[PDB]
Enzyme design. Sequence first.
Site, PDB file in Angstrom:
ATOM      1  N   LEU F  37      36.372  42.152  41.493  1.00  0.00           N
ATOM      2  CA  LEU F  37      37.331  42.286  40.407  1.00  0.00           C
ATOM      3  C   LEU F  37      36.720  41.770  39.112  1.00  0.00           C
ATOM      4  CD1 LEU F  37      40.710  41.246  42.078  1.00  0.00           C
ATOM      5  CD2 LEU F  37      39.621  43.498  41.956  1.00  0.00           C
ATOM      6  N   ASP F  38      36.929  42.518  38.031  1.00  0.00           N
ATOM      7  CA  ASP F  38      36.377  42.185  36.728  1.00  0.00           C
ATOM      8  C   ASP F  38      37.378  41.340  35.940  1.00  0.00           C
ATOM      9  OD1 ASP F  38      34.527  42.071  34.726  1.00  0.00           O
ATOM     10  OD2 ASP F  38      34.412  44.236  34.383  1.00  0.00           O
TER      11      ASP F  38
END
Lengths: 115, 217, 125, 48, 69, 79
Positions: F37-38
């Site tokens: 996840l960014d």
Amino acid sequence: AVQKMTRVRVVDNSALGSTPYHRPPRCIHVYNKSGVGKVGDQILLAIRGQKKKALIVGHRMPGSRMTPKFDSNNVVLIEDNGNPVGTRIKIPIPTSLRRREGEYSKVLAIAQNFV
Amino acid sequence: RFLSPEFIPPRGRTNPLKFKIERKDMLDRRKVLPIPEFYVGSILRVTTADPYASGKTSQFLGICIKRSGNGLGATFTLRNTIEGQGVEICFELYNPRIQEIQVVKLEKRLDDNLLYLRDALPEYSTFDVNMKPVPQEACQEVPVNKLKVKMKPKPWSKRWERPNFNIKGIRFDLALTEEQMKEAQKWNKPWIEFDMMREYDTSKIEAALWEEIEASK
Amino acid sequence: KFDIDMLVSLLRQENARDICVIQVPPEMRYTDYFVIGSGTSTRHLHAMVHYLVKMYKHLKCRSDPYVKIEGKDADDWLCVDFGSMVIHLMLPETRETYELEKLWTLRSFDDQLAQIAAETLPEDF
Amino acid sequence: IEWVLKNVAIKLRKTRKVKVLTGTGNVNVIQPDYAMAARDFLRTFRSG
Amino acid sequence: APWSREAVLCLYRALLRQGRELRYTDRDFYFASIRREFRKNQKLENLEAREKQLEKGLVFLHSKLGGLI
Amino acid sequence: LTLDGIKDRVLYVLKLYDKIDPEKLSVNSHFMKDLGLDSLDQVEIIMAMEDEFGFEIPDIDAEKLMCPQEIVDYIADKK
Ligand SMILES: [Mg+2]
Ligand SMILES: [Mg+2]
């Protein structure tokens, strides 16, 4: 006052009008009982060895008081169904188009500036 | 003492009564709305109500290039360029849907018509839309801007060099050879300025109107 | 009355899949409210427009003008212009291409407008 | 090279006027011929 | 690349909060569109390009969510 | 408060999220590496938590959570 063989300027973002060509577009027909075309009138245009419908949005001839007079004859390309060929217009457009008898809502949506 | 152009009657065979009647209505509108003093070349901002829409106003800013008309039909035209597209609108002073007239910058130019700005370079017609009013001084005379504009290639909307137009605000030396200038002078008509029956003296008429306008105040 | 609240409920009843409502500042002299509605099929679009016009005619009265229907020639985009509201109905493919939400939301910062440029040339070379 | 070819094109006198429709109005732009200018320059180079 | 990489995260948070309060329009559609804009542009950007992109988003937030109602 | 309730409640909301694949939805599941996840992805994950549980989590420490147990503990001690 656009007539047969008048040279017109395509004020639109469409590729067809945008791409430079050795000949400027010329009017072929005016959809009026008279031959004279004013703001809000459709015409038949000859572009790049092709024929396309278009709409007049400005011209250099004087009109009634309190209305804008432009420096060039400006036109917008219209598809056969009546949907605009292009997706954006940047030059100011008169507000008289709103009430004149005809179908102008679609073109008004795409135009940002009204003078 | 600045008497507005429309008040001066034109010469002809019309009765004076028609002018008195028109003046009364003109003065009444001026009490409701004030019409500022201005000259050709000054920048103005005019606010007017838009008929098509409901209760929404409009504003247009430009330089005044011509003053015409007499009586209740007086007009003035002001010009500007938006997004590189030139536009002019002709306004009637006494049209009831004009909310306000604001003189952004009061100044005078060498000539009383600037219609040749159509053929000048675009920079001389562009004005900032949001420019704020500049100060003015009562105990002064109106300034005279002496700029001389530069023109585009020779094919123009009119032959401005010809003597009839009497243009004094174009840099002709840059655009024309001295040979062409002599070519133009063949249309001079020198005798017109010296014949005394083509002159319309309005000094007395100007004076009489002044007191009546002031007296009504 | 036929106001924004009535119109949205009417659109809700007729099952408009995607609805966008944009208010318009007075600076632009076009209209108070801008409404865009998505539509599944051309037959569905015709039904949606006809019902709204029927409803508008019934509720309005006195000195209220009649309203035209535009875009019947076109098979995918229909627009109706009321006094203070403007409604555009079109299919999903048509809506995304023209991307009308972007322009009116971002009045002068639209990406498509930025792509357009200006033109000047001293000579043909 | 553009400036010198413009002068040679003018020196050759092969120019075409074209009318360009702009937002400020139509203007008569001048289009010289690079091809004709280049050909004349080549002849001078080949000649003594 | 941006004016600050905290502004991008802070800016995104505010948009979602304002969407929660959106009444007439389909909130779900607005949320999805915002994500798509936030997804596509920010993956690849440059200082000058990124500054203008975030600048345009900034005005969108500061104008009542660009008129959405 | 029930710590087990918090854990499953956090698990349930995370499970509802579609982009993350619940291949290993353990109590110590990481986000940068385990779920990939960014920075944008975590914020909406935080919102997916705040939707019904929390509502006052700041970004300064939300980005530092990085696992369900940490947020489980973080929400537990703030309420
Ligand atoms: Mg006359
Ligand atoms: Mg002429």
